[PDB]
């Protein structure tokens, strides 16, 4: 036994879905990919890494690319720091950045007469 989850892009985009059977082998279910989260059916597994869209678990995410695919999530761009013992990097220019931060302050004040 186990849970059944439906993986979907918005219905504003597509009516295609993939189904995850949680904690079960793909051999017991009756684009079939076995994950640590369970058996994922309807998504095409690829060897490319992308930013996570819809999380599946254990590093696996799914996205709509058209059909639904499954992949190992990327943690970000790979970069090598110019590490040295006699060289320093110094900015010759700058930019002024403005970013937004949003915080909740209060709730609606409800009252229920028991």
């Amino acid at each position: 036994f186990g849970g059944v989850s439906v993986i979907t892009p918005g219905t504003n985009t597509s009516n295609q879905v993939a189904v995850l059977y949680q904690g079960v082998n793909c051999t017991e279910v009756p684009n079939v990919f076995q994950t640590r989260a369970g058996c994922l059916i309807g998504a095409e597994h690829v060897n490319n890494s992308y930013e996570c869209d819809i999380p599946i678990g254990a590093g696996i995410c799914a996205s709509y690319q058209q059909s639904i695919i499954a992949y190992t999530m990327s943690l970000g761009a790979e970069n090598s720091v110019a590490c040295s013992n006699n060289s320093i990097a110094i900015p010759t220019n700058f930019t002024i950045s403005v970013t937004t931060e949003i915080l909740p302050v209060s709730m609606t004040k409800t009252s229920v007469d028991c």
Binding site: G2, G3, Q22, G23, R36, A37, C52, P55, G57, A58, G59, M73, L75, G76, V81, A82, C83
Partner: peptide
């Protein structure tokens, strides 16, 4: 039932390594 974390132990270790590499070679600038 128990659900797996989205990030694996290896992925977390990679983040930690990236932070250490940044600090050691570029200080606080990164």
């Amino acid at each position: 039932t128990v659900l797996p974390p989205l990030l694996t132990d290896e992925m977390i270790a990679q983040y930690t390594s990236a932070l250490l590499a940044g600090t050691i070679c570029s200080g606080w600038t990164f």
